[PDB]
Amino acid sequence: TMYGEILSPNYPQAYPSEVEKSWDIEVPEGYGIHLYFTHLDIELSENCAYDSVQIISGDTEEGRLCGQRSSNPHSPIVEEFQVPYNKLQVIFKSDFSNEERFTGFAAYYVATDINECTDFVDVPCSHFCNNFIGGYFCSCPPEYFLHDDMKNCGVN
Amino acid sequence: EPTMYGEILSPNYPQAYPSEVEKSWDIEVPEGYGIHLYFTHLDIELSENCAYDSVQIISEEGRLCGQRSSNNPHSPIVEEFQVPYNKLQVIFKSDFSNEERFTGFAAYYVATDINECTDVDVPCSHFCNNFIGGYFCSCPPEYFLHDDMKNCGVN
Numbered sequence: 258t259m260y261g262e263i264l265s266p267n268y269p270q271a272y273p274s275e276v277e278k279s280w281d282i283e284v285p286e287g288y289g290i291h292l293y294f295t296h297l298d299i300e301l302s303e304n305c306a307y308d309s310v311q312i313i314s315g316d317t318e319e320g321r322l323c324g325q326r327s328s329n330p331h332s333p334i335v336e337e338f339q340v341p342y343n344k345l346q347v348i349f350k351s352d353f354s355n356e357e358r359f360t361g362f363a364a365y366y367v368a369t370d371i372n373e374c375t376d377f378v379d380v381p382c383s384h385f386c387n388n389f390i391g392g393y394f395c396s397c398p399p400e401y402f403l404h405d406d407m408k409n410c411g412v413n
Numbered sequence: 414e415p416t417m418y419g420e421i422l423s424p425n426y427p428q429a430y431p432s433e434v435e436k437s438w439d440i441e442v443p444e445g446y447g448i449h450l451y452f453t454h455l456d457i458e459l460s461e462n463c464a465y466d467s468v469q470i471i472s473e474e475g476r477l478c479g480q481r482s483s484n485n486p487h488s489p490i491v492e493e494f495q496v497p498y499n500k501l502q503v504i505f506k507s508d509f510s511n512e513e514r515f516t517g518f519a520a521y522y523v524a525t526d527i528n529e530c531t532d533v534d535v536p537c538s539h540f541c542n543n544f545i546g547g548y549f550c551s552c553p554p555e556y557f558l559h560d561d562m563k564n565c566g567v568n
């Protein structure tokens with residue numbers, strides 16, 4: 258998708274006790290993901306060991322959140338992540354009884370274009386790199402032609 | 414028809430353009446996008462206010478002529494335009510004889526996302542969320558989005 262919404266179970270009301278829920282997010286190849294939380298109302302615990310919302314990018318934990326926090330008066334964002342990959346996983350955990358009636362979280366994500374020409378160490382073209390939304394293409398100086406590898410330019 | 418990018422080359426490029434010719438190109442990207450048009454090669458007759466040979470960009474966004482180049486190795490841009498519309502017209506004109514054998518131009522265009530949230534008839538009652546190609550509205554907790562997809566309410 259190019260965008261989506263992720264809401265904790267029962268949101269905007271108190272989340273269920275003793276539950277674990279997972280969501281997988283995927284955008285097209287050629288894009289990264291901007292994930293932003295607009296509501297965070299989770300029981301606070303040391304190192305968020307009990308209730309929590311985790312953001313995973315592989316086997317790698319990108320973030321782990323708990324507690325209550327609000328926003329910047331002109332933006333509802335309370336926490337956000339920008340990742341260079343097109344897949345991400347979010348996991349929500351509620352441990353024991355939710356007696357204080359915490360309401361969970363709300364997050365949104367949007368696909369972001371990867372700039373293949375500038376985001377990395379080397380330019381993927383011998384000569385001119387042209388970034389566009391979803392991909393990129395190489396081009397050449399006048400009187401040059403692009404080889405079949407769609408990367409290198411040559412002359413006859 | 415609508416494309417996300419493209420190339421525009423003067424007639425006979427990369428060799429000398431013909432004498433006495435006029436050519437036009439219609440650029441179109443999808444709704445929800447603007448256009449970034451950039452020139453990587455400019456070798457046209459020089460005249461004041463480009464009254465003779467010229468490349469005109471119309472939505473007049475600009476008019477170019479003369480000869481100029483860039484030493485930027487991977488992103489040569491001698492002239493560029495960014496328009497918030499999804500259609501543009503480019504017109505190349507060559508008048509009289511091209512005795513100096515000028516070689517014209519090379520340009521590329523790419524669609525750019527329009528951020529509907531920041532550009533000023535607010536499209537959402539509460540929160541606007543921009544994304545590539547569109548935008549969506551959202552609501553504060555305990556408020557629901559009406560079926561019109563723009564206004565939030567409560568029961």
Ligand SMILES: [Ca+2]
Pocket residue numbers: 287370371372373388389390391392393
């Ligand atoms: Ca790209």
Ligand SMILES: [Ca+2]
Pocket residue numbers: 445526527528529543544545546547548
């Ligand atoms: Ca948009």
Ligand SMILES: [Mg+2]
Pocket residue numbers: 300307308351352353354355
């Ligand atoms: Mg708990």
Ligand SMILES: [Mg+2]
Pocket residue numbers: 458465466507508509510511
């Ligand atoms: Mg002339």
